[PDB]
């Protein structure tokens with residue numbers, strides 16, 4: 010197992026410090042069933 | 051929709067200690083209590099305790115508070131909503147009345163008035179406490195016998211005689227043959243050794259194209275036995 | 291206890307439902323920044339738009355007239371609210387959210403207002 | 413029947429009034445695009461602003477305290493709602509919409525809240 | 535929102551058990567470099 | 583035994599998404615390429631909120647924050663070169 | 675155990691049946707939830723009922739629970755062959771573990787009769803070498819689950835070396851059992867034939883082997 014250092018691409022440097030972070034969008038709308046009804050018309 | 055798989059059966063001498071494991075999968079191990087319940091002939095089913103994999107809080111029944119030690123490992127994630135884990139119970143100062151079947155069980159709800167309530171159960175672990183030593187079985191063939199002459203059906207099997215302790219597992223054709231298998235419970239001889247029988251029902255015409263092998267495993271003695279059931283019958287009704 | 295923004299993301303749906311104001315506060319508050327700020331108010335106004343057509347503009351929780359079709363999920367009250375997280379719930383109800391939203395504006399609000407006109411007509 | 417966005421633009425005002433959710437859904441949902449998106453949310457928030465000052469934020473229809481001055485239109489219920497389209501109606505009531513909107517915030521909401529303070533003062 | 539993995543032995547993709555959330559990441563130095571990475575953040579416990 | 587759907591606004595639910603991020607750094611005293619004339623000052627204190635029980639899948643290799651940062655450094659480099667002296671006549 | 679159940683109850687096919695669960699006030703009902711479990715012997719149990727009325731997920735509406743101030747009850751409607759087994763109640767609170775009851779065995783009346791299947795195997799030649807002799811009489815697919823087994827040596831009863839198992843329930847909801855007769859090689863060779871007789875209140879079946887063939 011022989012190892013050579015490389016630096017083919019510059020993004021790898023950003024991956025070295027962004028490995029821990031991830032972007033997500035909040036979907037604050039949830040619908041769930043309860044035994045409740047709205048006031049009847 | 052997960053499976054709990056417990057450690058194999060063990061034989062231990064009275065006064066010794068034993069550690070039973072309970073490996074989990076198919077759910078978040080951290081979210082549910084793990085209960086431990088046993089069943090013995092003398093006291094019936096008896097709840098021993100539970101432990102929380104999340105906080106480590108344990109609650110043992112007073113009868114087992116001084117002889118049971120419960121521990122858990124940390125969950126190994128698989129996906130975001132499932133993981134694998136393992137819980138352990140170490141019981142010491144074993145007695146003859148502790149012989150029986152032990153179960154681990156997953157709790158019911160993450161919150162509520164019955165969160166810990168055992169809902170999903172494992173396959174069970176057989177514990178034998180005895181001064182007697184382990185003994186392997188002797189396997190003998192059960193020659194084919196007629197079941198229906200007009201229907202052309204027969205029954206053949208293998209006899210497992212004088213082993214100790216329980217249990218013994220039997221398969222056919224390395225698990226390829228599962229249809230028509232009937233395995234019978236063991237007998238308790240006056241000597242203290244067990245013995246059981248297993249039979250399979252097959253068409254009488256099937257003699258030149260299919261092999262029938264009974265595979266006996268007695269893991270306590272680390273013995274495997276592969277016996278070929280001789281298909282030549284001595285029954286006259288089957289001879290026809 | 292106040293655990294903070296998204297504090298009960300990993301709790302049961304019932305426990306998380308108590309702190310909806312927590313997620314609600316921070317939910318609203320050069321070119322890259324400006325485009326991002328517009329996207330933020332755009333998403334916020336989309337959800338407020340859906341609450342509008344469901345007749346629930348000023349409330350965080352509101353009850354509906356749509357019955358729960360059992361094909362959606364076969365769970366019960368105890369199993370939903372005391373055993374599951376909103377995340378894994380939203381994943382289980384990801385095939386119906388469009389469908390349920392359509393029934394949500396039509397079954398009730400598209401008939402609550404017609405009956406409201408025929409009722410207040412005297 | 414659901415005819416779609418603006419489906420009843422050419423029907424009678426009464427028939428069109430049943431499908432207000434249809435027009436309401438799509439009413440909200442580089443530089444050219446960004447400026448257009450801002451203009452869209454700006455117009456939407458303007459109308460929601462007017463519904464706000466008329467005390468009708470969460471509803472599609474609401475009734476008022478302003479009486480119908482006959483100088484505005486001399487038609488009746490049957491002639492308005494079963495013979496005309498919202499388009500030609502908005503053209504007939506294009507001289508009063510500013511005036512009616514001013515009376516709409518002042519006559520009721522600018523006096524509904526004062527009386528509300530004098531009423532809940534005990 | 536941004537999710538931050540605080541798992542020390544985190545092998546480079548996978549499920550992170552201990553996760554915290556932030557609106558902004560920590561101060562990342564844009565060090566232009568080749569082969570060896572310079573003035574960065576160090577992994578705790580074992581090298582990763 | 584009669585169940586009706588109920589709306590909840592502000593539920594802890596998220597999905598994987600790629601959006602346009604922006605810069606932030608505390609104000610210092612000049613003119614370095616990255617800070618430029620202006621980059622939004624950081625909050626005095628960030629609020630890092632631990633999420634108990636929450637297990638999420640990460641992928642550093644399929645991450646878009648990397649590609650964004652990559653294009654940002656490149657574009658910033660060019661934005662800093664425009665006003666300076668171009669040495670076209672130095673090819674003698 | 676201080677938590678008592680009905681030792682046995684019976685119900686007819688297609689009917690309902692009720693199991694009781696009572697005990698001292700130190701263990702019983704007002705301040706304690708009651709849960710019910712189906713527990714076939716030799717297998718893992720199944721939770722049917724928890725928190726009194728509320729049944730576990732997937733449980734059929736045939737099962738219902740009810741708790742009074744002095745005792746708790748479990749009702750099984752539209753009885754099936756698989757419902758014929760053992761049932762346990764447990765008394766519990768949120769922070770305190772299970773207390774299991776004494777147990778109740780349910781019998782389902784009005785079920786169809788199943789004819790017994792009897793098979794008798796002689797000792798193997800490898801076994802006669804040892805030198806021992808064991809006859810094996812295997813019984814399956816009988817209902818109700820109760821048998822009486824008798825052995826005969828040259829048409830005459832045998833009493834030394836007889837061991838018979840208890841009846842056991844098959845996967846197909848019929849019952850099974852087995853019996854073993856240990857003999858010395860002289861007794862085996864000194865007789866014309868041996869017989870295993872399985873007796874049931876409805877029919878007695880006889881299977882016979884002979885050392886000759």
Ligand SMILES: *[C@@H]1O[C@H](CO)[C@@H](O[C@@H]2O[C@H](CO)[C@@H](O[C@@H]3O[C@H](CO[C@H]4O[C@H](CO[C@H]5O[C@H](CO)[C@@H](O)[C@H](O)[C@@H]5O)[C@@H](O)[C@H](O[C@H]5O[C@H](CO)[C@@H](O)[C@H](O)[C@@H]5O)[C@@H]4O)[C@@H](O)[C@H](O[C@H]4O[C@H](CO)[C@@H](O)[C@H](O)[C@@H]4O)[C@@H]3O)[C@H](O)[C@H]2NC(C)=O)[C@H](O)[C@H]1NC(C)=O
Nearest residue numbers: 081102104107108109161162163165300301634635768769
């Ligand atoms: C992250 O996920 C985890 C796991 O999914 C989750 O942890 C569970 O959280 C839920 C709800 O939040 C818990 O469910 C409740 O548990 C309550 C607390 O349990 C009590 O009883 C325990 C056993 O007591 C015996 O043993 C002890 C010795 O250990 C002995 O002294 C006692 O006398 C008794 O014999 C006890 O260990 C436990 O103590 C822990 O918790 C308390 C805080 O409650 C803390 O002070 C301790 O330091 C210790 O950590 C506690 O005393 C239980 O009371 C409760 O039941 C009540 O509420 C329900 C309504 O919810 C009512 O219906 C009911 O009538 C009761 O009033 C309920 O059952 C569960 O126990 C957790 N653990 C699991 C599942 O393993 C986290 O909350 C999640 N976190 C986030 C942020 O999402």
Ligand SMILES: *[C@@H]1O[C@H](CO)[C@@H](O[C@@H]2O[C@H](CO)[C@@H](O)[C@H](O)[C@H]2NC(C)=O)[C@H](O)[C@H]1NC(C)=O
Nearest residue numbers: 560561562563564565571572573574575576577
């Ligand atoms: C280079 O590494 C050294 C350690 O070898 C760093 O010095 C430490 O910096 C931290 C702040 O991150 C301090 O808490 C420590 O007290 C420092 N160590 C000692 C021995 O004083 C230094 O910050 C690193 N340089 C960088 C990252 O540019």
Ligand SMILES: *[C@@H]1O[C@H](CO)[C@@H](O)[C@H](O)[C@H]1NC(C)=O
Nearest residue numbers: 356357358359360361362393
């Ligand atoms: C419920 O879902 C089923 C899908 O099998 C569908 O056929 C039915 O119309 C739905 N019922 C209602 C009331 O919406």
Ligand SMILES: *[C@@H]1O[C@H](CO)[C@@H](O)[C@H](O)[C@H]1NC(C)=O
Nearest residue numbers: 362380381382383384385386
């Ligand atoms: C959503 O639909 C797809 C295909 O119709 C199916 O594979 C998936 O299981 C559905 N989701 C759920 C939660 O049933």
Ligand SMILES: *[C@@H]1O[C@H](CO)[C@@H](O)[C@H](O)[C@H]1NC(C)=O
Nearest residue numbers: 478479480481482483484515
């Ligand atoms: C109605 O319109 C007329 C215009 O001739 C105006 O004089 C009058 O004040 C209006 N009435 C009301 C009540 O606003």
Ligand SMILES: *[C@@H]1O[C@H](CO)[C@@H](O)[C@H](O)[C@H]1NC(C)=O
Nearest residue numbers: 484502503504505506507508
């Ligand atoms: C609006 O006003 C103008 C001039 O005051 C007039 O010509 C026009 O007819 C008015 N509109 C209506 C509908 O009366």
Ligand SMILES: *[C@@H]1O[C@H](CO)[C@@H](O)[C@H](O)[C@H]1NC(C)=O
Nearest residue numbers: 364365366727728729731732
């Ligand atoms: C629980 O869910 C099952 C499955 O649909 C349902 O039949 C049963 O009535 C529910 N039980 C309770 C106690 O709500």
